[PDB]
Amino acid sequence: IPAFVKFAYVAEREDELSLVKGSRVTVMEKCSDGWWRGSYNGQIGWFPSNYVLEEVD
């Protein structure tokens, strides 16, 4: 199961991801640092958990 995005943010940079207004993304990574990795149906990069619903299926 993927995640549910709430708020949208426009900004793409190394370590920066843009959030959607109301879509679903795959947010689930396990890093030893504070920054987590995330995947999106159509693109991959940084976890958008900033404002998303994550479900560990």
CA 4 to chain centre: 9
Round to whole Å and give the CA distance between 18 and 25.
11
33 within 8 A of 48, measured Cβ to Cβ: no
d(CA 46, CA 48): 6
The label of the residue with tokens 């299926």 reads 57
**What kind of experiment solved this structure?**
NMR
Q: Give CA–CA dist 51/36, Å, rounded.
A: 14
Class of domain 1-57: mainly beta
DSSP the chain: --EEE-S-B---BTTB-PBPSS-EEB-----SSS--EEEETTEEEE--GGGEE----
Domain ranges within the chain, ordered by starting residue: 1-57
Please give the distance of CA 42 from its chain centroid, rounded to a whole number: 12
Q: Which residue type occupies 7?
A: F
Query: Within 13 Å and on the Cβ side, how many CA atoms surround 15?
Result: 3
